[PDB]
């Protein structure tokens, strides 16, 4: 099972200027409960964006995709291809834009957090992949963040 997990503005934006363009602590907790104890796969830019205090993300096997054959990072398994990245029976792809697109055809689950923030797309933004008719989803009830954004959870699957 390969799953994709991301948080996106309604607009589809997941990243800008190398950052996630909002704060949503509740989403982190959700992310942790999905990924804990599993292999996670991420592109090199997403690895770089992890705060040093949690690079690698603890309790998870950190797998980092890079085309740099000699790229190394403490606590991460650097691999040069997706095939090398997806060998664990349960694998969660945690970003970013490039790697979601790369892994999408291999995926049968998506766990999405929608953030109700006004954030029109800008050129060069990292974006969420588009889920077509092959996917079924269940939409969670809107929740209200400690800071004030409304957000909700989607679970998508295809068999
Ligand atoms: N909202 C969310 O849920 C998330 C948001 N983000 C945001 O996403 C943005 C970064 O995403 P993005 O910019 O798309 O970059 P990625 O995080 O997808 O990493 C891209 C890198 O992955 C490597 N790579 C890509 N394709 C391949 C391949 N086919 N084979 C081998 N290596 C490959 C390259 O590394 P090299 O260049 O070293 O070869 C490339 O530069 C940031 O803004 C981040 O904050 C990140 C994660 C989740
Ligand atoms: C939490 C953000 C997030 N939400 C959802 N739904 N899906 C994702 N794939 C990511 C992601 C990501 C990259 C990232 C960036 C970051 O700051 C740049 C922090 C984390 C992060 C840090 C700590 C923990 C943890 O303590 O478990 C988890 C994620 C993770
Ligand atoms: Na829900």
Curated annotation (Swiss-Prot):
Q: In which pathway does it act?
A: Cofactor biosynthesis; tetrahydrofolate biosynthesis; 5,6,7,8-tetrahydrofolate from 7,8-dihydrofolate: step 1/1
Residues holding NADP(+): 6-7, 14-19, 43-46, 65-68, 80, 94-99
Q: Which reaction does it catalyse?
A: (6S)-5,6,7,8-tetrahydrofolate + NADP(+) = 7,8-dihydrofolate + NADPH + H(+)
Reported EC number(s) for this entry are: 1.5.1.3
User: What top-tier enzyme class does this entry carry?
Assistant: oxidoreductase
A Gene Ontology biological process term: folic acid metabolic process
- InterPro entries documented for this protein: DHFR (IPR012259), DHFR-like_dom_sf (IPR024072), DHFR_CS (IPR017925), DHFR_dom (IPR001796)
Keyword list (alphabetical) reads: NADP, One-carbon metabolism, Oxidoreductase
Q: Which GO terms describe its cellular component?
A: cytosol
Q: Which CDD domains match?
A: DHFR
Q: Which residues bind substrate?
A: 5-7, 27, 32, 60, 100, 113
Where's the DHFR domain? 1-158
Q: Name one GO molecular function term.
A: dihydrofolate reductase activity
The UniProt record lists the keyword Oxidoreductase: yes
Known regulation of activity: Inhibited by isoniazid metabolites. The prodrug isoniazid is metabolized to isoniazid-NADP adducts that inhibit the enzyme at subnanomolar concentration.
Q: Where are the transmembrane segments?
A: none
* Pfam families referenced in this protein's UniProt entry, alphabetically: DHFR_1 (PF00186)
Q: Which cysteines are joined by disulfide bonds?
A: none
Main function: Key enzyme in folate metabolism. Catalyzes an essential reaction for de novo glycine and purine synthesis, and for DNA precursor synthesis.
Question: What family does this chain come from, according to its entry?
Answer: Belongs to the dihydrofolate reductase family.
Any idea what this protein is called? Dihydrofolate reductase
User: Upper lineage ranks?
Assistant: Bacteria, Bacillati, Actinomycetota, Actinomycetes, Mycobacteriales
């Amino acid at each position: 099972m390969v799953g994709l997990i991301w948080a996106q503005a309604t607009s589809g934006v997941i990243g800008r200027g190398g950052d996630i363009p909002w704060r949503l602590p509740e989403d982190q907790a959700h992310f942790r409960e999905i990924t804990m104890g599993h292999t996670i796969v991420m592109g090199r830019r997403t690895w770089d964006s992890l705060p040093a205090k949690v690079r690698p993300l603890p309790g998870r096997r950190n797998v980092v995709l890079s085309r740099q054959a000699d790229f190394m990072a403490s606590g991460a398994e650097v691999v040069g291809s997706l095939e090398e990245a997806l060998t664990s029976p349960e694998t969660w792809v945690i970003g970013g834009g490039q790697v979601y697109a790369l892994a999408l055809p291999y995926a049968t689950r998506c766990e999405v957090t929608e953030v109700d923030i006004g954030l029109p797309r800008e050129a060069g933004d990292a974006l969420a992949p588009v889920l077509d008719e092959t996917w079924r989803g269940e939409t969670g009830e809107w929740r209200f963040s400690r800071s004030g954004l409304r957000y909700r959870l989607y679970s998508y699957h295809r068999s």
